[PDB]
A paper describes a structure:
GFAT-1 activity is modulated by UDP-GlcNAc feedback inhibition and via phosphorylation by protein kinase A (PKA).
Strikingly, the dose-dependent inhibition by UDP-GlcNAc was completely abolished in the S205D variant. Instead, its reduced thermal stability is likely caused by altered interactions between the glutaminase and isomerase domains.
Residue numbers in the entry:
A (entry chain B): 2 to 227, 244 to 294, 304 to 681
B (entry chain A): 2 to 227, 240 to 295, 300 to 672, 677 to 679
């Protein structure tokens, strides 16, 4: 889900400029949830903007943001020409995991039929059922099936039983969160407090941007406990930007204030003050990073930019002149890591495949047991963990609920924890003892592509550090590092086969299933390839360990079943050729991803995808890219949007 | 593929009786699959059996053993009434590898047109190219494309170049195998050694059964290295009468006798003058005569129409057999006799590794959680093929379990030898007596589910499941804090046979589901926790038996991609049981329904909520959480069975040649 609000204080904006700002804000956050959207702004049609802050209009519609963009416009009651010197508007895009994505269930929610209080919410309230019964007895009627409504019906209950006639908006929100259980990120708006906003969080991101041509009173807001706020000095011109992510604010300003758990920010009279019952900083992001450029989709950009993102992952860490590796995030802990006795990798989805993809080389260069676990199952079994375990947590977002819960589980047992993330300041990067930022740049496509290859490389670099004191492994280290030096250019060679991959897609897009087979270093490749094809093309693709064919799954192969096989020139080549002969004996006609020089395979197979040869423990990077491209072209042929796959969104931060 | 030979020594048998014994033997070996079969025996219609020991007759044919039986009795120039006091007949079912199926490529292969030597062979001789060239240069002509023929020609080469006129049949075979490369099980017969047999193996099973109404000389045959006297071989003491049975599978011997000798690699067994001796080339090493508990009834369909149906519906009995003598339901204790001398060491180790293939691997996934809970040790579950590819680190304080119904699976066996070299304590969980994995592990447990004749693993899965739970119960038997948990689990084991019958009584409900999926090409099977393995195992069964694209999906992973497959057309089966993951499973159900999925749910009989909100539900009885996996997988076994029947497939049919 995504949160965005626009508060213009004494900055005259017309009602159109405001709505186009809310919509444009949801467009930046749409990849986090695109089942339904909605906005909340001040209604009425009075020239004097002051006589309009007593009427709250809500426009909510099912579908992507483009469905709300058109619902907002071409309306017969709203006059988009009213000038507002002061105004507050809130917006929200929802990932409807449960129930129907109906306008009633979308945000902002409301507290009554007159819209006295409206709130937008990211997260889950674990006790909303108790709150719902308590509020129903006091005379409040519920309309939607969402847990967010209990927050709106409750903030009004604290308002209908206050002690003084002028209790600050903060005091009301403070009493609410004390009754809420779970994780949440909230932004309130009310008619009683015109232009006032309140932002509190607890286990979910929520920052506050700010723009003003004038100077700010401070760059360090002092947190308070139940003059001294952030605001322009001489004049009042200020624009705030509440948001759950930075991509929605970077286009307007690069000055934000990342809140923390139970911090209740409040903008009053155009002054930001934090209450709790704190550091205006510059963002290191460029807008170009979250633009499609000349590509028609984000996913295509992020696939073709992998030559660059791989380089950025190694920048300032790998030195090819003297063959050294240094990960600054691990300098103070690498010594203690080497005294540990087991490595555990915990992650979800594609991030889990990155651990499968590097498990073998990690076992080789560290000589330690390496265990790779799906976060959800890791938690279900209450896996044993000990004080001399090193536990890695791979997460592009750094907020995945299952991976994050596994982190807190391993900390409670005294393990040394390491974070491999692509999001600075994320929960996983903050709560681990050390870690590495893969530095692949923002990923907007729902399906992770460059995050996978950058996680791959990051884990290889770690493996290189763990063995830099072994004489017997020096040549092996050099071999790997030379492969890393040549990897960006070999990726470019793979991308140049884009047209050849597209032609093969035209022969498969009509099929219902496809089996992808590989072993050894390329077990992860066929699992990741099968997940991508599932995710964006909706074909029933499955990854099958090649060594397991003879134990049952080979029965599913016939001349009609599509098959893709990975046969690279490493120590499993002969066994892979054996599996290929098994498939052919069952009349299968597979597409083979093989090496350019593999002349034997190229002659005896009609359809081959010839990738350049790299070091055996890096080849997985070059073998997965063809399957990234195949999934893209397959999705285009089937008429689906690669950036917005049905039934989900990016980053699973809730149950 | 299948070997069987019958040697009657001073037990008079007619030629008809001998041939009916060979045919009956091969009928016990058909379930392994084959394309051709043949037999070899003494021909000639001289009433004195002693004069016919120089004319070997062969009857080989492409097709099923039944057709071979017709060809036998369909011989005008053969008299079936001759009585042989001594005789050796051999028989073979072939699974073609080198040479296409045909009468010429069928076994027994011969050494020349006069049939001076014949041999039946299971396996492949790798260097059959080099050997064929050498024999062709010495003046030997081949008539088949089989690698086996080089064995028949080579033994004659050794005979034609023997230094002494009385070189033993054993010596000739020793020189043959010293020149062979690969895997083989062999039985030899020759006119120059009438009434004698020689069997040897390398990497392929070969056993010998014995029967006599007289006392035998010993139950432990000492090995002989390069004097054969009364004190070194097996024979009837006071009289000559005795019968020997060579076979590659005990299923072909058990109806005649239950006393068998399992040969080992490079053993050369020979019967000379009705006496059995075992030779090698290189405290007192020897081979034991042991008693199999196998019964002919265990390898017969009975009233069932298929072995798959039998083995699914007898799981109440096989589960009981797995627990017999091991779980005391009078004082609630567990004792696995196979681990008595090692349970002490095992409890001092620091990690458990389970290594297996296919369904046996799923049995490790199905018990990983309870093993972690009751042992408190790290438990790692590994597919044997990937375990080898990665050169997984293993240490001296690891306990490595090797799960294999057959006890012969190549990758699992190579995993075992890998772990032994690194000093790990090794444990075999097998269902085949005499198998390589049961012999080479430090200790082991025979799951005792009875022979598995069906093509897919059904009772072996649930019997492995139970065996590993029993081991987990042993490991925590000294912990006060776990007594209640152990009792809860053991009462679940006590009730499990009756709960399986209760699930089998819902067969009619499963048939209704099969008709719903009859026309479908894919189905997703979703679950988590204790039932992750149920999804993988059910998906494998439906793939293997029904040939449709079933896939197991970890429910906790849906929102990370796989949920995109859900719509109103994709069939889904979800497992929702009453354990600690119930709420999370309900969560996954709402995620599927919200996207137009209409899944079938396997749930508890008393889960009234899900039964009302879901159209079709398979309602199994509730058991202990770490045992529900057995009850929830059986509806998927039956589903695979019924779907295959509806589509006209032969569930007992397994489904290139150089
Ligand atoms: O293509 C699939 C997606 O990339 C998805 O499977 C992703 O890998 C998980 O959602 C993990 O999320 P994070 O690694 O970002 O926490
Ligand atoms: O239905 C599955 C089959 O039974 C097959 O997958 C089998 O489980 C493996 O070939 C392992 O065989 P073993 O149990 O003999 O090791
Ligand atoms: N390799 C031999 C025997 C194969 C077998 O029956 O296992 C052949 O093809 O004739």
């Amino acid at each position: 889900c995504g949160i965005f609000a626009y508060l213009n204080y004494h900055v005259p904006r017309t009602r159109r400029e405001i709505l186009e700002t809310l919509i444009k804000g949801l467009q930046r956050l749409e990849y986090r949830g695109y089942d339904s959207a909605g906005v909340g702004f001040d209604g009425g049609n009075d020239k004097d903007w002051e006589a309009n802050a007593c009427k709250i209009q809500l426009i909510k519609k099912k579908g992507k943001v483009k469905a709300l963009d058109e619902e907002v416009h071409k309306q017969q009651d709203m006059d988009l020409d009213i000038e507002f010197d002061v105004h507050l508007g809130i917006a929200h895009t929802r990932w409807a995991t449960h129930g129907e994505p109906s306008p009633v269930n979308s945000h902002p929610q409301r507290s009554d039929k007159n819209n006295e209080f409206i709130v937008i919410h990211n997260g889950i309230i674990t006790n909303y059922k108790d709150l719902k019964k308590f509020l129903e007895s006091k005379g409040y009627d519920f309309e939607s099936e969402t847990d967010t409504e209990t927050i709106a019906k409750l903030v009004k209950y604290m308002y209908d039983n206050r002690e003084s006639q002028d209790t600050s908006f903060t005091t009301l929100v403070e009493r609410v969160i004390q009754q809420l259980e779970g994780a949440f990120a909230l932004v309130f708006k009310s008619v009683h407090f015109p232009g006032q906003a309140v932002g509190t969080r607890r286990g979910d991101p929520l920052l506050i941007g700010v723009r003003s041509e004038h100077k700010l009173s401070t760059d360090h807001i002092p947190i308070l406990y139940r003059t001294t706020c952030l605001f322009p000095v001489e004049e009042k011109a200020v624009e705030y930007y509440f948001a759950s992510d930075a991509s929605a604010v970077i286009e307007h300003t690069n000055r934000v204030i990342f809140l923390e758990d139970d911090d209740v920010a409040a903008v009053v009279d155009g002054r930001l003050s934090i209450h709790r019952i704190r550091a205006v900083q510059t963002l290191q992001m460029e807008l170009q990073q979250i633009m499609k450029g000349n590509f028609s989709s984000f996913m295509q950009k992020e696939i073709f930019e992998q030559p660059e993102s791989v380089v950025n992952t190694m920048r300032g860490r790998v030195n090819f002149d003297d063959y050294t590796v240094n990960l600054g995030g691990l300098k103070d802990h690498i010594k203690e890591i080497q005294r540990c006795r087991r490595l555990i990798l915990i992650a979800c989805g594609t991030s889990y495949h990155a651990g499968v993809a590097t498990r073998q080389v990690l076992e080789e260069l560290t000589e330690l047991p390496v265990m790779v676990e799906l976060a959800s199952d890791f938690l279900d079994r209450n896996t044993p963990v000990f004080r001399d375990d090193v536990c890695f947590f791979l997460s592009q977002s750094g907020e995945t609920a299952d991976t994050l819960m596994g982190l807190r589980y391993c900390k409670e047992r005294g393990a040394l924890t390491v974070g491999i993330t692509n999001t600075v300041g994320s929960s996983i990067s903050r709560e681990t003892d050390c870690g590495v930022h893969i530095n692949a740049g923002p990923e907007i496509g729902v399906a992770s592509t460059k995050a996978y290859t950058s996680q791959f490389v990051s884990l290889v670099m770690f493996a290189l550090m763990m063995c830099d004191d072994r004489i017997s492994m020096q040549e092996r280290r050099k071999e790997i590092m030379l492969g890393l030096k040549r990897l960006p250019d070999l990726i470019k060679e793979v991308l140049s086969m884009d047209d050849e991959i597209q032609k093969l897609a035209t022969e498969l897009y009509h099929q219902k299933s496809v089996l992808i087979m590989g072993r050894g270093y390329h077990y992860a490749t066929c699992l990741e390839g099968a997940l991508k094809i599932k995710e964006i093309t909706y074909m029933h693709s499955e990854g099958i360990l090649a060594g397991e064919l003879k134990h049952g799954p080979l029965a599913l192969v016939d001349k009609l079943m599509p098959v893709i096989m990975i046969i690279m020139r490493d120590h499993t080549y002969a066994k892979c050729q054996n599996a290929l002969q098994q498939v052919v004996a069952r009349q299968g006609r597979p597409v083979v991803i093989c090496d350019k020089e593999d002349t034997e395979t190229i002659k005896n197979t009609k359809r081959t995808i010839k990738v350049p040869h790299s070091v055996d423990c890096l080849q997985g990077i070059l073998s997965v890219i063809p399957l990234q491209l195949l999934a893209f072209h397959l999705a285009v042929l089937r008429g689906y949007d690669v950036d917005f796959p049905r039934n989900l969104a990016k980053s699973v931060t809730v149950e």
